[PDB]
Design a protein around this ligand. Structure first.
Ligand SMILES: CC(=O)Nc1cc2c(c(-c3cccc(C)c3C)n1)CCCN2
Length: 154
């Protein structure tokens, strides 16, 4: 009862790229770039595909940074999110009907307008740590419970 997702953070030495979602899942918030993995598709291929579809950017090297399982109470399916990061990209971010990309200085990451779990694992991401996490949500704003631990192997 867990569905595979990817999430890609474009993280450079002094800034991170996030995308403001205009409609649908995550709308109104700054998000990394991700979505469902397709049939016959590897997780890494899915992550590379999602980055392109949502941001316009071509990624060469992707690094595994974490896994986060999300539960929304009253919803049967868990989100099994494989998180990736990259520093080497090609192209420039593309604004679309769906997504408005913007760079943020690391000290100006807009946590108040991001999913609340971000405040927990972004510090790990920013210091190049790998992690396993689990977040139980009620609705989209409230974390009921969570666990988060650093790992050597995602
Ligand atoms: C930084 C960031 O994106 N944080 C972030 C946090 C977060 C989610 C997502 C998310 C948003 C859109 C699509 C997908 C597949 C995912 C996992 N992203 C989904 C649900 C709970 N928390």
């Amino acid at each position: 009862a867990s569905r595979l997702y990817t999430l890609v953070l474009v993280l450079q030495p002094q800034r991170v790229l996030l995308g403001m979602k205009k409609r649908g899942f995550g709308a109104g918030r700054w998000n990394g770039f991700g979505g469902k993995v397709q049939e016959g598709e590897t997780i890494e291929d899915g992550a590379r595909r999602e980055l392109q579809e949502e941001s316009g950017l071509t990624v060469d090297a992707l690094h595994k940074v974490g896994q986060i399982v999300f539960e929304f109470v009253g919803e049967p399916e868990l989100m099994d999110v494989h998180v990736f990061c990259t520093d080497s990209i090609q192209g420039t971010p593309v604004e679309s009907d769906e997504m408005r990309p913007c760079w943020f200085q690391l000290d100006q990451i807009p946590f108040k307008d991001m999913w609340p779990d971000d405040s927990y694992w972004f510090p790990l991401l920013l210091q190049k740590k790998k992690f396993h996490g689990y977040f139980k949500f009620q609705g989209q704003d409230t974390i009921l419970d969570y666990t988060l631990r650093e790992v050597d192997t995602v």
